[model samples]
Target: PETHINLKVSDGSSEIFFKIKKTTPLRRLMEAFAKRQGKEMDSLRFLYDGIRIQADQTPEDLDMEDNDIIEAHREQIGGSTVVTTESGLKYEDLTEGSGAEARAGQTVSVHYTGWLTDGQKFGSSKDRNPFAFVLGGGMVIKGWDEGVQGMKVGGVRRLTIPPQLGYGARGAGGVIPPNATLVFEVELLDV
Candidate 1:
């Protein structure tokens, strides 16, 4: 029998939902959702439960089960920027967590809040849940790969990654504007 899943985007965000058979793959789940929203399948990104899945990997690889909640959205662009610190914390000051001084492959978990220069909160994992990523795993932005290194668990730091490191000149959909530099208050949760 087919199982129904309840999915929610942001309140004012895109509208998406899904229903699938028990044997569906994560990629197929996302692809179907994208098709329903009229979005290009290739341009969408998927988060199974909460973990980011690689483009080539499927639900079976992660051992997804029936009724698993998945979130799908457009991919954010990588921006470039110059780092500077006026007060509090800075990316340069963060050098302890899992990715803090990370090598090629390391798993890191974090809680983060991202905002625009005007203090508008754009995205946040802390509000909904914590996030996990593998450093140098190409699962996140370049700024994250470069900035996250040297952070220790339970540490808090801020990153002022340039558009080149962030979402670039062509920022993500509407949440971020073009050439915008992102500021994040990230907590290194664990390795």
Candidate 2:
């Protein structure tokens, strides 16, 4: 006896339907939804009956019926430990963007403002042309090289750069003092 299941996936905003074999892994539908939505496949979570489902899990395993709905949503977006630099860099998204994730070897355009730990504004790019540079290319400070990676275009992030990564003991042209930790709010515009 062979059976096929008609399923629907939704994000509460839109939905897509799939007709798949009962034994077929839900990975197929999950990936299809992610691609159709123009989202990173790994960044989405699928839920059925209010319980999370794994990619390899099948509808048959959950006793699913035809026309049942699966919910999809983006995963939590912080504390990524995938790639890191020495001494650690702290960054969190103030606003998450839905676009390609910035990566090393790509040129990124951003607008940013810097502040000393004491809250004195030191620099900004808002008044001038947006800064564009190759990521992880040593074209910028070590913090910028590592902190800006994985950001999506149109997102804003706040980075707390340690002194060693900012300017070390040399500092920045006498504007930033020696061994000073820095804070920067960066907006990614394009890559």
Maximum-lDDT candidate: 2
Score residue 88 of candidate 1 by CA lDDT: 21
TM-score of each: 0.49, 0.55
Instruction: Give the CA lDDT, 0 to 100, for residue 49 in model 2.
Output: 95
Residues 39-141, candidate 1, lDDT per residue (tens digit)?
7877666666667767566545666654455655442335223345343223633323433443457787788878766556798885655788888887888
Clashing pairs in 2: none
Predict model 1's lDDT versus the native. 0.61
Worst ten-residue run, lDDT, model 2?
75-84
In order of listing, the candidates' clash counts read 29, 0
Candidates in order: C-alpha RMSD to true structure = 15.1, 14.1
Q: Per-residue lDDT of 22-134 in model 2, one digit per residue for the tens? A: 99999998888888756788778788998989989998999999999898865355533333346677776766767888899998999998888766679989856698999
